[PDB]
Ligand binder design. Structure first.
Ligand SMILES: C/C(=C/CC/C(C)=C\CC/C(C)=C\CC/C(C)=C\CC[C@H](C)CCOP(=O)(O)O)CC/C=C(/C)CC/C=C(/C)CC/C=C(/C)CC/C=C(/C)CCC[C@@H](C)CCC[C@@H](C)CCCC(C)C
Ligand SMILES: CCCCCC/C=C\CCCCCC(=O)OC[C@H](O)CO
Ligand SMILES: CCCCCC/C=C\CCCCCC(=O)OC[C@H](O)CO
Ligand SMILES: CCCCCC/C=C\CCCCCC(=O)OC[C@H](O)CO
Ligand SMILES: CCCCCC/C=C\CCCCCC(=O)OC[C@H](O)CO
Ligand SMILES: [Mn+2]
Lengths: 867, 9
């Protein structure tokens, strides 16, 4: 037929269409809903940078005073993705808002499809032409962090890391292949010079997408180092390999130069002159390898008298010297050697991040190959066989590209071991080496013959071997696509309760029009951010867990205290004010210390921070992880007697009982700010009032069609019914049920000792509080009382109501309470009763103006009897 | 889906 020299493009097109179905069509209904949902968190910060860059085109900010309030943080996100989305938005006339997000959602998907090309190139320039076709197909179905970070809506720079790293290695090894065996006058032609120039541009674009992309230079230097010290071992045109590297690194340094001075110091992620020195310094190291080979060529190592081994040895001594004599700038070493800390994380606080946890390990510290299936499918094991075979073949053929690919493979495996995120780097590794595996078997099992016997050839073809070549193609491709089809059917991002709450914040908190204007200003790059930023108008901060910082800035257009850059977390052990030391504050006086230092005016708390994410906040605040279970106790159990019990230790739980897989928090938890805010609805606090709460968790919103959420008994039976139903399958109860179970445990363990109850009802997913000076209600009191209590009923915008209590002790025959709610406020969460203030046997009722709450007015209210 | 967020929820 016509597929002659042309099937290889027929598979690439089919591979691209499979990639489109997984990346664009599968998560389509998850990205395009009630709004355009960019996935995760970081795609929302790129969206922030892009609509600012579009407004100030062609200029770009390198420091953001919005996030990390009130200090601002330097922007490490690369100019590649920022300028790509910015130009893409202008071409489609989408400069902000939902229309801009719809354009940005396709960029990660297109990068995932386009990755077929650099994977083909790298595989062809190392192995053969058939294997490059398998690798292109396999990279179209590999799941895990590669597929999820290249899906529709996940406009992050991780796909462009993988795209440009593989592009750099392919173009570099293509340049070495086009240059080897030729003299310099031939390699100096424009046709030959184009190959290392292209390789240098791909390296520059790699760094321009990721400040830590300079790591490609020591990897390429590792190619030359091992090719030199093994001159009799490996067979490589070392002189032309050195010259390709010189041109490649010089061009890359020129590409990086115009972006090199946007950080006031050396940095490995921020766009600083450190990366410029790594690229420029790599060019002179490659130029030093030029002399060592030019000296070995003439025979300089035998005239001095060291032997053929001398040339390897002088490389080793200079590898030690040329680094040792680079003490001319010790900050360079400190940042260069800093890479070894990247794959290690004894921080513990950092461990609580979902993307950083080490591969091959459970949250119990035991080896596992379970993520290898969930992230690569069969390609991992098919990839190891291709790696081991490549090592076997390298020891026989001694091809240099096969050696460099192995070095790349082993370096990416160490990074994969460190953090599970770097699976987006190892994805192209298993796809390339499984292609090497499947290509070996397809030739030895006569499938390459039967394919050409199918049209226009004659071969001795064993259908028994062909049937098995088809059967292991099954095993490599089918279970891999199964996981990719499932994982691509949903996309992450904020839920409606988070989005609705944040849009409400943007339109119902003061200065929304000033924040909107300041959101698009081209901020100057400061020399330091250790002092609070000098804002052009009176700003305020919004404190929450660091997960939601980008959502706060991009959706609410408000300045968050903490962000997904793990900035603004703070801790308690050092009294560093931040998110953790605020939400784990054990009394309101300490939380006011943290809030005042950070100029906090608003608090956003969700049910996640209340339940399953509270453990991380105690880990950050305390630093030590075993020092964090102090906030936790035992478990609930459904015993064979048909009753529900509670035990401190697992041994106290009776046999045949059914253990709700939910660790009930300790008494210390219920005294912290997160409990007082979300689980007690702000009761007991004098400087905070609830102003807005979102809808319920979806499960309980569904439950309310047949459950009376004003009936504590009906809620309790429903929560206990669900918890057992899901404990039967070893699954935790839903979040809305975890909150109800948390409230039930407080009433059965720590309530009777105090007298302040909590309604067993559920509540809204996201809750917003405003920081208040507070109306000071002070007055005289009778002769023999030591305590004064305040009572008021609050009703939220979801028609849910709760009690606000506060108790103070009498001193000098006088009480003083500070009240955060008012009775003429504009907020959708209002009190429906006056304040009932009790002083022993004397009761009085008071209503408070909003002006007295804002300005902290003192009100005299005596509760005294003669007696 | 593990991304730049707190885990186990
Ligand atoms: C050892 C390696 C480890 C890599 C993995 C790792 C520990 C870290 C990298 C992880 C990674 C992918 C990225 C981290 C980058 C950084 C700094 C930060 C990232 C922050 C975060 C991820 C991003 C946050 O932002 P977000 O993305 O969330 O928005 C590298 C590969 C090199 C090898 C020699 C391994 C080969 C394997 C084997 C089995 C043989 C070993 C045998 C041996 C006998 C040992 C051999 C010993 C040697 C020293 C030879 C090395 C040669 C060469 C490199 C030296 C030349 C000059 C160098 C110094 C650079 C010069 C630069 C300047 C000065 C010009
Ligand atoms: C290289 C850059 C790629 C640019 C591609 C952008 C082109 C078209 C985007 C529009 C896709 C349709 C989305 C849609 O149905 O919107 C309807 C409601 O917004 C649903 O929320
Ligand atoms: C002298 C060096 C100056 C370098 C200036 C580069 C600055 C920003 C790079 C972003 C521009 C987009 C590049 C582009 O469209 O090509 C990439 C694929 O072809 C399309 O996905
Ligand atoms: C062919 C060569 C195969 C090499 C296989 C090595 C596998 C894993 C190496 C990663 C070690 C990283 C450091 C580590 O274990 O933990 C560091 C703590 O954080 C120290 O506190
Ligand atoms: C009433 C007497 C008690 C004294 C303790 C003070 C406690 C809290 C005062 C907080 C005042 C709110 C100010 C705020 O959050 O924003 C600061 C920007 O001016 C924007 O409002
Ligand atoms: Mn990210």
């Amino acid at each position: 037929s016509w597929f002659k020299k042309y099937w290889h493009l027929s598979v690439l097109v089919i591979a691209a269409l499979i990639s489109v179905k997984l990346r664009i069509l599968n998560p389509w209904n998850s990205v395009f809903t009630w709004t355009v949902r960019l996935g995760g968190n970081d795609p929302w910060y790129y969206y922030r940078l892009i609509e600012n860059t579009i407004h100030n085109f062609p200029h770009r900010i390198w420091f953001d005073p919005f996030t990390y309030y009130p200090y601002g943080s330097y922007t490490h996100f690369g100019p590649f993705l920022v300028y790509l989305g910015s130009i893409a938005g202008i071409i489609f006339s989408a400069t902000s808002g939902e229309s801009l997000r719809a354009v940005l959602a396709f960029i990660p998907a297109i990068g995932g499809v386009l990755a077929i090309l650099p994977v083909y190139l790298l595989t062809r320039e190392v192995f053969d032409k058939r294997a490059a076709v398998i690798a292109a197909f396999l990279i179209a179905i590999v799941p895990g962090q590669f597929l999820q970070r290249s899906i529709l809506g996940f406009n992050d720079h991780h796909i462009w890391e993988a795209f440009w790293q593989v592009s750099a290695l392919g173009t570099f090894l293509l340049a070495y292949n086009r240059w080897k065996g030729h003299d310099l006058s031939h390699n100096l032609t424009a046709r030959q010079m184009a190959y290392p120039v292209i390789a240098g541009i791909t390296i520059g674009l790699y760094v321009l997408s990721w400040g830590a992309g300079f790591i490609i230079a020591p990897i390429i230097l590792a190619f030359m180092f091992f090719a030199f010290v093994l001159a009799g071992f490996v067979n490589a045109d070392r002189k032309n390999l050195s010259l390709v590297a010189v041109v490649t690194f010089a061009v890359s340094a020129l590409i990086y130069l115009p972006f090199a001075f946007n950080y006031p110091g050396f940095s490995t992620i921020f766009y600083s002159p450190f990366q410029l020195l790594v690229l420029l310094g790599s060019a002179v190291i490659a130029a030093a390898f030029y002399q060592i080979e030019k000296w070995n060529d003439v025979g300089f190592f035998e005239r001095v008298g060291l032997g053929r081994k001398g040339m390897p040895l002088a490389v080793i001594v200079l590898t030690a010297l040329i680094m040792g004599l680079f003490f001319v700038i010790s900050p360079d070493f400190a940042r260069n050697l800093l890479s070894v800390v990247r794959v290690v994380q004894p921080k513990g606080g950092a461990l609580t991040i979902a993307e950083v946890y080490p591969f091959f390990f459970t949250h119990n510290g035991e080896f596992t190959l379970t993520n290898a299936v969930l992230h690569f499918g069969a390609l991992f094991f098919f990839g190891m066989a291709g790696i081991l075979y490549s090592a076997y073949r390298f020891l026989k053929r001694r091809s240099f590209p096969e050696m460099a690919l192995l070095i790349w493979a082993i370096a990416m495996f160490i990074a994969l071991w460190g953090q599970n995120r770097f699976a987006y780097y190892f994805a192209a590794v298993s796809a390339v080496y499984s292609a090497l595996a499947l290509s070996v078997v397809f030739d030895k099992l006569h499938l390459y013959r039967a394919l050409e016997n199918a049209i226009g050839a004659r071969n001795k073809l064993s259908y028994f071997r062909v049937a098995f070549a088809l059967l292991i193609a099954l095993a490599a491709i089918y279970p891999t696509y199964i996981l990719a089809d499932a994982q691509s059917s949903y996309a992450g991002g904020p839920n409606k309760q988070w989005y609705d709450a944040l849009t409400w914040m943007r339109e119902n908190t003061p200065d929304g029009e000033k924040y909107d204007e300041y959101y698009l200003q081209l901020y100057p790059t400061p020399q330091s951010n250790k002092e609070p930023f000098s804002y052009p108008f009176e700003t305020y901060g919004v404190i929450s867990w660091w997960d939601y910082g980008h959502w706060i800035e991009a959706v609410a257009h408000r300045m968050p205290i903490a962000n997904p850059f793990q900035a603004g977390i703070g801790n308690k052990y050092n009294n560093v004010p931040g998110a953790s030391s605020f939400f784990t504050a054990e009394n309101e006086s300490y939380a006011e210390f943290v809030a005042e230092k950070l100029n906090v005016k608003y608090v956003v708390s969700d049910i996640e921070m209340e339940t399953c994410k509270y453990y991380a906040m105690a880990v950050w605040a305390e630093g030590d992880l075993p020092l964090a279970e102090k906030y936790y106790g035992g478990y609930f159990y459904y015993s064979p007697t048909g009753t529900f019990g509670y035990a401190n230790s697992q041994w106290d739980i009776p046999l045949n009982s059914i253990i709700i897989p939910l660790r009930i928090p300790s008494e210390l938890y219920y005294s912290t700010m997160e409990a007082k805010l979300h689980l007690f609805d702000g009761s007991g606090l004098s400087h905070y009032r609830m102003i807005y709460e979102s809808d319920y968790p979806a499960e309980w919103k569904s439950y309310s069609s047949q459950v009376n959420l004003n009936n504590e008994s009906q809620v309790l039976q429903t929560a206990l019914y669900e918890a057992v139903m899901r404990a039967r399958y070893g699954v935790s109860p839903t979040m809305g049920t975890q909150e109800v179970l948390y409230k039930y445990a407080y009433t059965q363990l720590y309530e009777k000792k105090m007298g302040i109850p909590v309604k067993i009802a559920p509540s809204g997913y996201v809750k917003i509080f405003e920081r208040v000076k507070g109306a000071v209600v002070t007055g005289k009191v009778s002769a023999n009382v030591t305590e004064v209590s305040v009572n008021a009923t609050i009703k939220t915008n979801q028609n849910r109501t709760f009690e606000y209590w506060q108790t103070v002790e009498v001193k000098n025959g006088t009480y003083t309470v500070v009240l955060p709610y008012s009775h003429n406020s504009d907020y959708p969460v209002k009190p429906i009763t006056p304040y009932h203030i009790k002083a022993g046997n004397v009761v009085k009722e008071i209503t408070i103006y909003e002006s007295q709450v804002q300005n902290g007015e003192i009100i005299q209210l005596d509760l005294e009897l003669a007696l | 889906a593990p991304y730049a967020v707190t885990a186990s929820c």
